[PDB]
Amino acid sequence: FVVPDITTRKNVGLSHDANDFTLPQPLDRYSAEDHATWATLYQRQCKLLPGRACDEFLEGLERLEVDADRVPDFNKLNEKLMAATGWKIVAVPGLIPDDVFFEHLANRRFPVTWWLREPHQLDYLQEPDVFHDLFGHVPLLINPVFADYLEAYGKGGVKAKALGALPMLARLYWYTVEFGLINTPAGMRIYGAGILSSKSESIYCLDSASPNRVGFDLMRIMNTRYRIDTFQKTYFVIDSFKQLFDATAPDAAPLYLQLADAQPWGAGDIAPDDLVL
Ligand SMILES: [Co+2]
Numbered sequence: 001f002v003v004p005d006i007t008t009r010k011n012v013g014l015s016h017d018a019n020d021f022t023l024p025q026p027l028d029r030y031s032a033e034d035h036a037t038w039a040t041l042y043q044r045q046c047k048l049l050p051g052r053a054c055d056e057f058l059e060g061l062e063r064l065e066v067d068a069d070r071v072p073d074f075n076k077l078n079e080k081l082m083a084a085t086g087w088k089i090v091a092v093p094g095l096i097p098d099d100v101f102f103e104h105l106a107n108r109r110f111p112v113t114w115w116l117r118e119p120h121q122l123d124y125l126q127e128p129d130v131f132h133d134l135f136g137h138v139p140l141l142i143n144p145v146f147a148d149y150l151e152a153y154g155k156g157g158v159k160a161k162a163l164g165a166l167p168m169l170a171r172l173y174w175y176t177v178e179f180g181l182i183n184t185p186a187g188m189r190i191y192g193a194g195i196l197s198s199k200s201e202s203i204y205c206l207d208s209a210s211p212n213r214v215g216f217d218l219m220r221i222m223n224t225r226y227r228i229d230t231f232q233k234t235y236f237v238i239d240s241f242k243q244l245f246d247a248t249a250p251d252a253a254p255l256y257l258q259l260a261d262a263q264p265w266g267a268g269d270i271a272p273d274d275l276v277l
């Protein structure tokens with residue numbers, strides 16, 4: 001009753017660094033179908049994202065020359081990214097160990113799953129793939145403030161691992177980099193990669209009365225559970241990317257220790273002290 005999963009199937013015949021888990025992007029492995037799936041996904045997202053995605057995201061797609069019609073060549077994209085913020089993307093097989101992921105970010109390397117979902121999975125894939133990782137995550141790396149936030153997040157991995165607090169950082173990442181909203185004078189916009197690559201979450205997170213929208217608060221977020229297989233019950237809202245970066249500056253160690261003893265908020269809870277939008 002067990003068959004190899006998509007990550008295993010896609011990486012047949014390929015290898016990865018046993019410590020940093022990178023490989024050269026295997027350009028030869030992309031089929032015509034892959035390029036067509038990419039183009040379909042790209043087109044679908046670009047139709048639905050105007051007035052929903054933050055303006056910086058859509059600008060980043062353009063400035064980085066993210067291919068509309070084929071899976072991007074990572075090396076070519078890196079020429080633009082490096083000149084902008086000194087970041088680059090690196091190819092990985094799929095999910096990688098946490099300390100490796102943090103080490104990458106700490107060194108301004110963004111790990112991107114190299115392979116793409118199959119066409120029958122157009123609507124949704126549970127695993128990260130190159131569409132979610134590249135299209136969703138990479139365009140904001142052109143923004144120097146957002147890029148510094150990621151670098152600072154990466155550097156915080158060492159302290160968090162030493163204190164048994166990686167899950168608390170994982171929650172911060174989830175509720176910002178993956179599922180964050182940013183308020184603007186024009187209305188609420190989206191910066192989270194998991195929403196930006198989604199067929200439908202883009203609609204729900206802005207239009208539905210169902211989810212909570214709560215002002216960003218570092219300690220609250222680090223004490224908040226999430227689930228991976230459903231639309232978010234709570235979205236955290238920032239005023240600016242500067243708020244994220246500034247949140248990483250003070251000593252996180254006493255926050256971890258105070259939370260180690262604590263009971264976390266459920267994914268759909270509102271805390272007594274929340275600023276509820
Ligand atoms: Co392996």
Ligand SMILES: [Co+2]
Pocket residue numbers: 128132133137178193194
């Ligand atoms: Co992601």
